[PDB]
Amino acid sequence: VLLKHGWCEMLKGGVIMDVKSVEQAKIAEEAGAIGVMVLENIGVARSVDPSKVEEIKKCVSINVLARVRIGHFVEAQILEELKIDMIDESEVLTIADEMHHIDKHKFKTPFVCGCTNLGEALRRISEGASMIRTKGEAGTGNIIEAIKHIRTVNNEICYLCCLSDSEVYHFAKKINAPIDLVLLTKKLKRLPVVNFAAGGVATPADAAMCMQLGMDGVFVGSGIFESENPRKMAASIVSAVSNFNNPKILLDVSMNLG
Amino acid sequence: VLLKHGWCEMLKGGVIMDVKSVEQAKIAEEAGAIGVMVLENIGVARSVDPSKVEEIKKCVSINVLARVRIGHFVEAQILEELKIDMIDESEVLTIADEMHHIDKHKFKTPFVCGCTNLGEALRRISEGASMIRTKGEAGTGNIIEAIKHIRTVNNEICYLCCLSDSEVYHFAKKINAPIDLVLLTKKLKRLPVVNFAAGGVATPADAAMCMQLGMDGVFVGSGIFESENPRKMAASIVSAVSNFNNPKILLDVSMNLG
Amino acid sequence: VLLKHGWCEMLKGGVIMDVKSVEQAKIAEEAGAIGVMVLENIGVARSVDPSKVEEIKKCVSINVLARVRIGHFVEAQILEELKIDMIDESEVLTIADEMHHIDKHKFKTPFVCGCTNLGEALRRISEGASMIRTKGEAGTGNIIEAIKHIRTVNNEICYLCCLSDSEVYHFAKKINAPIDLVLLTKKLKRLPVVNFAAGGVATPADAAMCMQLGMDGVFVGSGIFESENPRKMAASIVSAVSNFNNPKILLDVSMNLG
Amino acid sequence: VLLKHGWCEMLKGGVIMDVKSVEQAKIAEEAGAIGVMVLENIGVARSVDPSKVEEIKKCVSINVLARVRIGHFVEAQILEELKIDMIDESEVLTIADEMHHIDKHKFKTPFVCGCTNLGEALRRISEGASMIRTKGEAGTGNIIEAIKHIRTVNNEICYLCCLSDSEVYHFAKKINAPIDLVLLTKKLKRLPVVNFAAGGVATPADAAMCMQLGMDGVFVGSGIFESENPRKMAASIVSAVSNFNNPKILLDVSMNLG
C-alpha cells in the first residue's frame, strides 16, 4: 500500500475532470489536468463499459480513473485487469452492496472513496482506500456540502490533535474509527492519505476556495464541457488550483468566463 | 475600519438601484442614485462575472456594489482585486457556507450584510460589516417584512436604551450579541453603522415610509426597470427618499407613475 | 373628531359602491349612491395611483373614497394631500404592517376600518376611525360572513347593555377594548360611530337584510357592473336600502334584476 | 380619588407589618412602621373578624389595614363602615369571586391590590385601586418572585417610555390595559399610583434590595415576630428601608440579627 501512497502523493495539487469521451479527455489533458474520470455518455447506473475506458486510456497520457458501484467487487476485478490507474468506489452510481464496501486490500490498483466525516474517512482508509474525496452533492453545482464536509473533517482532525492520550480512546468510539488510524491522524495532524474535493466545484473561485481550506486537489464534474468555452473554462479551473493563493490570477481567470 | 465607516456615513440618505446592465446603470445614475448593485442578467445563483462588474464600473461615476454568496471568501477576494466600492454578502444568492460568514476584517473593501434583528445586526458588525440592510423578502415586492424588521430592530435598540447597567449583560446573552457593541448601541441610541432598507421597496410611498421609520437609505430591486417608465419611476423613488417628510412632493411623484 | 363624526352621520342610510373607472363612477352617481370607492382597474395589491383617484374626484359630485394598505401610513398622507373624502384602511389590499394600524388621529381625513367583533370595532375607534364596516368575505358574494359579523356585534352590544357596572370591567378585558368606549357603547346602546355593512351584498334582498339587522348602509362591491344591467341593478340596491322595510318595493326591484 | 392618592403618596418609603394581635401591633408601631395589616390569629381563609380590627385600630396611632377576599364586595362594605385606613383585596385569602374584582370606585376607603405585570397593575388602577403591591410568593420567604415581578414591571414601564406614539396602541392591546392609563404611565415614566413590595421580604437586605429597585415601600409578613428578637428585627427592616442606599447602616442592622 506504501507504493500506492507514493503514487498518490504525486497526485497532490491537481485537477481531475470527469470526461465522457475521447474529445473531452483530450481537452482535459491539454487544459492541464492530472487525470480524467471516465464517465457514461448518457434507471440503474452501472460501471461504464470497459471498452470505453480502454479507448480513453490509449488516447491520453495522463491518469485514467473509473467508477464502480459501492460493493461490486467484480466490476473492480474487471478494471483491475484493465490496468487502469485508479478505481473510484462511487456513490453516484447505484449501490450494489448497501452493507459492505469492496475489500480494497486484494487489489493492486489504488482506490478512492467518498467521505463526509473523519470517522467515515478513517474507516475507508482501514479497508484499503489510497485516497479520499468529500462526497458533497454531485450534479447540483452547489459547493455548500463540499465546504461543509471539508470544515467538518478539518475541525475533527484538529480537535483530535488538541485532545489527550486517555481521551483518544473515547473519541475513536464516538466517531467509530480504528484506534490505530486515529492515533496516526493525531501524529500527522492531517488525514493519513491524499484528500481531494468533489461535488459542486464549478468555478475557478470554487476550486480555489477548496484548496484554501486545505484539500490537496479538486474533482471537477462535467459542467466544464456543458459551457460556452470548455477549453478555457477547464484551463481556468486548473490555474485556480495551481495558484489558489494569488487573488490577481484568480481574478484574471474568472473574467470573461462566459 | 474608521475610514470605511466615514465613507459609509457619507452614503446616508441615498438610493441604491440593483441594475443588470450598462443602460440600466446609466438610468440609475441619471435618476440620482448613489450606487448601483450589479446583478446577473438572468438553479444555483453565483457571483456575477467580474468582467460585467468591471464593465459597469467604468461607465458610471457612482459607487458600484456586487454580490457574493454567504461565506464564499474567494469571490470576495476576486472582487476586492477589482477595486469595487462595496461588497454585499447576500442571501439572495445561494449559500456557500451555511455555517460561517466571510471574515470581513481581512478585506479593505467595506461589506454590507443583511439583518432581521438587533442581535444579528450586531454580530455582523462584530465580524466587520460596515453597513447593514434589513433582509425583508426579495423578489416579492411586499414591504411587510421590511417594515416588520425595521420596527423590530428599532424597538430593541430603544428598549435597550431604557434598560440598566446590570441588565445589559443578560440582554446581550438574550439577543446573542457581543457585549461591547451592545453598550455602543446603548450609548449611540442607534445602530453603530449605517443602516439601509432592502426588500419590497417598489413605490415612492414605500421608500418614504422606510425613511420615516429611521433608516438611512433604501435598496430598490429591479422592479424599477420592469415598469412602463424606468427613468421616471427611478427619479420618483430618489425624490421620495430625498423628501420623505414632504407629503406634497410625495403626492407629486406618485401621480401618473404608470 | 366630532366634525368627522358629524359628517359621517350624514352618510347614514346610503350605498357606497366600489367603482373602477369614470364611467362606473358616473353610473354610481346617477344610481343614487352617496359615495364611490375608487378601485384598481385590473401578486401584491397597493393603493391606486392618485391620478386615478383625482380624475374620478373631479367627475363626480358625491364622496370619493380610497383604500390604503393596513398600516401604510404614507399612502394615507398622499391621499390626505389629495383632499379625498374618506380613506379606507383595507384588508382586501396586502398588509403593509402586520402588527400596527395607521394612527388615524394625525389625519384630518376620516378613516373607515373593518371589524369582526365589538372588541375589534372599539379598538379601531380608539385609534381614530370615524366609521366601521364588517369585513365579511370580499370577492365571494356570500353574505354568510357579513350576517354572522352583524349579529355578533349586535349581540355583544346588547349583552353589554344588560350588565352591571362591576361586570363591565371584566367584559372590556375579555373583548380587549378600552374601558372608556365600552361604557360609551353601553350608554348609547349602539356602536359609537357610523356602521356600514360590507362583503357579500350583491342583491337588493341582501342589502335590505343588512339594513333590517340595524346597519346604517351598505358597501357594494363590483358585482353591480359585471351584470347585464349595471344602471338598473345599481338603482335596485339603492332603492332596497332606502326602502328596506317595504316588501312591496323590494319585490319590485328584484324582478328582472338579472 | 385624588384625595386617596394624596394620602397614599404620604405613605412612601415606609414599612407595613402584617401583625396578628395588639402586642404585635404595638411592637410594629414602636419599631417605626407606618401601618399594620391586621391578620387572622390562627381550609377557607376569610376576612378577619371586624372586632379584632376594631381593637387594634384603637391601640395604635398608625394606619390599620385589613384583607378582603378577591371580589367579596360585602366584606369591604363591612370594613368601610369600620372607618379602616386601607383595604387589601388579597390573594392570600380564598378567592370569593375568581371572575371579578371589587368595584373600588364605590368605596371611600383606598384599596391596595396585587400585581405581577404592568398590564395587571394598570387594570387594577382602572378599577379604582389607590396602591399596588407585587404578589410575590407569600409564606415562603423567597424574594425570587418579588424581585422577578419588580423587574418585569420596571422593564415594561421603561420600554413603554422608549416607544413611539403609534406603537402605544398595540402595546396597550398586548398587555391588555386601558389606553388612557398606558399613556399616563408613559408621561409619568412610572406607575401612576404608589407601589409597594410584598412577599419574601424577611431580612434588612431584602427590604433594601426592593427599595434599590424603585419600589416605594415594603410589605413585611409575620416572620418578623417568629424570630428571636421581634423588636430588633422589626426596627432593622425599618432602618433598611429608610437607609436603603447606605451600606454602612445596612451592615450595622444586619449584624447579630439572630
Add this chain to the structure above:
Amino acid sequence: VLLKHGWCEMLKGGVIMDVKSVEQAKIAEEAGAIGVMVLENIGVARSVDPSKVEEIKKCVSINVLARVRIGHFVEAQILEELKIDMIDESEVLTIADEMHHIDKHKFKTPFVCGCTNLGEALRRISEGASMIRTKGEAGTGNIIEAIKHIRTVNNEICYLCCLSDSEVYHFAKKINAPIDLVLLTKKLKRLPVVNFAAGGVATPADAAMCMQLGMDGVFVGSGIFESENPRKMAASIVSAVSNFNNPKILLDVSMNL
C-alpha cells in the same frame, strides 16, 4: 480588575475548606488551607449573618470567603462593607434573582462564580468574576459532575486553540460568550482567570485527580469535619493538592484514614 487577578494569582495550588464555626476555621488554618468559606451552622438558605463572618475573620489569618445568593446585590454590599477577602455568588443558596447576576464590576471585593461549560465561565468573567469554580454536585460527595465539567471546559478551550480565525466568530455565538474573551482564552490556551474545582472532592485521591486534570486548586465541602479525624483528613487533602503528582505521597496520606 487587574489587582483582583493578581491577588487570585497567589491562590493557585491551594485548598479552601467550607467551615461552619471558629474551631473548624482554626482546624482548616492549621491544616494548611489558604482560605475558609464561612457557612451557616444549621426552607430558604440566605447569606450567613455578617456577625459570624466577622467573628471568623478575626480568628484566622487566612482568607475568609462568604456566600451570597445569585443576584442579591445587597448581601454583597453588606459583605464588601465587612472588608471580607472574597465573595462567592453561589447556587447552593436559594436564587434571589433567577434572571440576573450581581454586577461584579461595582465592587472592590473579588467574586467567584460557578461554571459548567466554557461559555458560562466566559460570561461570568465578562460580568467581573475574578475566579471560577466547577459547579459539580454539592452535598453528594460524587466527583462525577466535577470531573465531567472539568473535562468539558478543558476540551472546549483546547478545541478552541485548534480552530481558525474565521471560525472563532461562530464558536463564540455557539457557546454564547463575548468574542473578546473567546480570543483571550485562545491566546492563553486556558481560562483567563484562576479556576478551582468544587463539588465532590472528599478524598485525597479526589483532590489530586482534579489537580491532575489542570485545575489551580480545590474547594472542599464540610465532609472533613463530619469524619473520625477532621484535622488529619484536612491535612491529607492539603498534601494531596500540594503533591498531586507524587503517588508515594498520595498513598501515604490515604492510609489509615
Add this chain to the structure above:
Amino acid sequence: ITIGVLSLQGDFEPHINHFIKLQIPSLNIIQVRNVHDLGLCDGLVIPGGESTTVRRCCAYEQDTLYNALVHFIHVLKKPIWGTCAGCILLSKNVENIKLYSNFGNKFSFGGLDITICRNDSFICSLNIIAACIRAPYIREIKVLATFIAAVEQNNCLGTVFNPELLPHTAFQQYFYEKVKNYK
C-alpha cells in the same frame, strides 16, 4: 444666526452634530431641502455626499431648488460652504465627465473660480497657510489652507476634505465666524 445644512444627500448629520457641539445657544441648525428652508437660513453648508444626487435632487419642478441656490449665492451673496462634493458644486468648471450631459456648465452652482477633477482615502496634516474620503483634486485656478486644502473666495468656502469626520470642530467654528462676520 441661523445656518442650514443641505439635507438632500448624505453626510448632513455629521455636519449638524459638529456644528451643535460648539455649544452656542444663539446658533441654530436646520435641515435644508426646499426653497422655504433656504430662505429661512442666513448661511448654508453642502455636506460631502454624492454630487450627482445633489444636482438631480436640486432639479425638482424645473430647477426650483437649483435656481434658488444659484440666485441665493450669486445675488444675496450669503456665506456658503462646500465639502467634498460641495466643492464640485461650488466650482465653475468641472471635467472628467465622460457622459455628454446637456447640463454643461450649469451642472455646478459656481462661485469659486477653480477647475476640479473628482477622480483613494488617507489622512493628511493640514498645513494651513483631515480625513480625505475620496477628496477631489483641484487642477486649475486666496487659498485658506494647504497640505491646496481649503479655498475661500468671497462668501464661498471650499474644503476637499471632511472636517466633520474628525473630533476637532475648528472648521465648523470657522464658518460660524464667517457667518457672524457677514451678518
